[PDB]
Amino acid sequence: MKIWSSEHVFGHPWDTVIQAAMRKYPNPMNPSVLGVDVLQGRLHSLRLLSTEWRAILGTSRTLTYIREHSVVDPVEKKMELCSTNITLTNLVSVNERLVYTPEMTVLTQEAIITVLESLMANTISSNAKKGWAAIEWIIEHS
Amino acid sequence: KIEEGKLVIWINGDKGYNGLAEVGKKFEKDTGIKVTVEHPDKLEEKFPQVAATGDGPDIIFWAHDRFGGYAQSGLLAEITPAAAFQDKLYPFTWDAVRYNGKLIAYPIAVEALSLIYNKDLLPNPPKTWEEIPALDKELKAKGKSALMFNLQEPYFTWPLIAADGGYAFKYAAGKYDIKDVGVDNAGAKAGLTFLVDLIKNKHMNADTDYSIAEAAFNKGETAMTINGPWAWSNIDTSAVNYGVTVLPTFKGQPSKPFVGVLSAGINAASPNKELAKEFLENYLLTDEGLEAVNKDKPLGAVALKSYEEELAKDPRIAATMENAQKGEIMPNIPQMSAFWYAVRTAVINAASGRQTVDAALAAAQTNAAANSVGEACTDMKREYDQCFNRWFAEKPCTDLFKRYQQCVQKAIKEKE
Ligand SMILES: OC[C@H]1O[C@H](O[C@H]2[C@H](O)[C@@H](O)[C@@H](O)O[C@@H]2CO)[C@H](O)[C@@H](O)[C@@H]1O
């Protein structure tokens, strides 16, 4: 059990940050993905991300699949996205909340890892740093 | 559901679908089994949509590059020709329609783009791309132009982009490296920059499409075009005196067209698998069957050895082969789908001036990202995703989504 919390503040409107948040396939992040179930008084959205990430690699020769559940329902600016690891061994859960705090916007995230574990923890934090950067990236190129 | 006791075949609208329907009549005459040949719009995108629901044609024709995507999504039946039958076609053609050790289609013909020129306007066609500006300048003085070809399909510009080193996916030891896309390198940039400079200097129009380029050549307005065997037929019915030749060199390197094997796949959901095999093996892949299609629109160099020996006498076919040999066989990996659009957008954007060459290709190298869990579903996705975002200008697109979801749900079957 390793936990991470971080918040990052985005020098951008909430709207644009959430728009970017919806896009993967950034240069920082490799993994492919798609929107399997979405319904809207509110918006819910359900995705599957295949994420690619050497003894450990042998242990997972097969590609690892990530499930995201995210809601943006309240008129009050909000998103929540929830990630699980699809395998036979140990879990990861990452939850992000994106709302703007004094419109710039800021997120607060957690990573909860269960099973070394230090590598896993180091990796998922790095992914989160990459992710902020990718959202920053996606703005420019959208 | 697909209809039992009958054959429905889909083939692209630029091909000899009337000739294929003659082969179909012959099948129907011998067996009483009706054969219907259609050419749906966007058939490469439609097939995955319908087939994902177990609907669609019994047999589908497309170039082999899209087939690995379709096979991976389970839309195609494994095919099982006897050793006897396999020996009738060139080995390399079978290799194009092999995916993961299995045959997923019958190879029909080898397609490559060539330079097509009007002998009366241009008895000596240019050997290099670099000559074309000066040629065009001279032809504009006569109220003509040097060259027009379809800019709206990256198929047609790819040979130029690839000539100095553009690629799709790296290849090493029998395996394509999908983490590396070669669409943003200096060679790729040079090629596209040449094209964009042709447009900036008024030697080409950014919106030239297949039919405009076809009408311009066959009505004698432009001295050259770039196209495949299928196009020769319409030039034959014009009064243009045409030659078909090796594509121009670029920076001293051969143009490198992407080479397609036109291939015929059987819908995995078809209840007419044996009839499809009968039709393909005993009617289409014969001297007389291929001749009938070829007479409608030329197939290129056919996979069937017996008939290729006859076709190889045609200098248009020898040109086709010279270009094919200088080019590269398309990968059939499922990612090709994403690559092809990724470039389709970049070229259109650089040509129209919405993006610089550098920014257009930089964006393509990313957009080549494989883009889906479902191998054949990538377009249904791009069609949908493109909408949901536009909808986020509201916070409609449901019609696309039902289609998107089925395709990826079918692939999600063989996983968790
Ligand atoms: O432009 C992208 C396109 O290239 C190839 O399509 C060719 C096709 O091979 C021929 O059958 C002919 O009709 O022209 C097409 C271009 O419009 C690939 O087969 C295709 O997958 C790719 O989308």
B320 to each of B109, B113, B280, how far by Cα in Å?
A: 11, 7, 24
| DSSP β-ladder status, B145-147 and B222-227 | parallel
| DSSP β-ladder status, B106-111 and B301-302 | antiparallel
- Contact (CB<8Å) A32/B371: yes
Task: Flag whether B1 is in a domain.
Answer: no
In angstroms, the CA B141 to CA A14 distance is 57
Q: Is B409 in the A-facing interface, judged by CB distances under 8 Å?
A: yes
Out of B373, B389, B404, name the one closest to residue A32 (CB): B373
- Same domain (yes/no): B363, B407: no
- Same domain (yes/no): B209, B345: yes
Q: Give the residue whose CA is nearest to atom 23 of ligand 1.
A: B340
Out of B369, B389, B392, name the one closest to residue A32 (CB): B369
C-alpha neighbours within 13 Å on the C-beta side of residue A124: 25
Domain coverage including residue A125: 1-142
**What are the tokens at A85?**
């690891």
Q: Coil, strand, or helix at residue A102?
A: coil
Terminal CA-to-CA distance of chain B, rounded, Å?
27
**What are the tokens at B84?**
């006897």
Say how many C-beta atoms besides its own lie within 10 A of residue B359's C-beta: 14
Tell me whether residue B39 is exposed, middle or buried, using C-beta atoms within 10 angstroms of its C-beta: 0 to 12, 13 to 18, 19 or more.
middle
- Same domain (yes/no): B22, B107: yes
Q: Evaluate whether B8 touches B57 at the Cβ level (below 8 Å).
A: yes
- Same domain (yes/no): B281, B221: no
- Eight-class DSSP state of B280: I
- Same domain (yes/no): B13, B71: yes
Centre of ligand 1 to C-alpha B260, Å, is 8
- Same domain (yes/no): B293, B309: yes
- Same domain (yes/no): B126, B227: yes
- Eight-class DSSP state of A89: S
How many structural domains are present in chain B?
3
Tell me whether residue B192 is exposed, middle or buried, using C-beta atoms within 10 angstroms of its C-beta: 0 to 12, 13 to 18, 19 or more.
buried
- Same domain (yes/no): B100, B130: no
Q: What is the CATH number of the domain that holds B120?
A: 3.40.190.10
- Eight-class DSSP state of B76: B
In angstroms, the CA B288 to CA B386 distance is 46
In angstroms, the CA B53 to CA B56 distance is 8
One-character DSSP codes across B111-141: E--EEEEETTT-SS--SBGGGHHHHHHHHHH
**Radius of gyration for chain A, computed over Cα atoms and rounded to the nearest angstrom:** 15
3-state DSSP of B86-115 = HCCECHHHHHHCEECCEECCEEEEEECCEE
- Same domain (yes/no): B277, B353: no
Q: Which of A87, A46, A91 is closest to A64 using CA atoms?
A: A87
In angstroms, the CA A71 to CA A93 distance is 16
Q: Coil, strand, or helix at residue B204?
A: coil
- Same domain (yes/no): B167, B221: yes
How many structural domains are present in chain A?
1
In angstroms, the CA B358 to CA B369 distance is 18
Domain coverage including residue B401: 378-414
- Same domain (yes/no): B346, B209: yes
Which residues of A touch chain B, with CB atoms under 8 Å apart? 19, 22, 25-27, 30, 32-38, 40, 43, 48, 50, 65, 86, 141
- Resolution to 1 decimal, in Å? 3.6
| Experiment used for this model | X-ray
Q: Coil, strand, or helix at residue A26?
A: coil
Task: Flag whether B294 is in a domain.
Answer: yes
Q: Which of B117, B114, B146 is closest to B316 using CA atoms?
A: B114
Task: Flag whether B373 is in a domain.
Answer: no
- Eight-class DSSP state of B253: B
Task: Flag whether B404 is in a domain.
Answer: yes
- Same domain (yes/no): B82, B173: no
In angstroms, the CA B139 to CA B116 distance is 16
**Max Cα distance, chain A (Å):** 48
Say how many C-beta atoms besides its own lie within 10 A of residue A121's C-beta: 18
- Eight-class DSSP state of B20: H
Q: Is B370 in the A-facing interface, judged by CB distances under 8 Å?
A: yes
B207 to each of B140, B204, B343, B357, how far by Cα in Å?
A: 19, 9, 16, 17
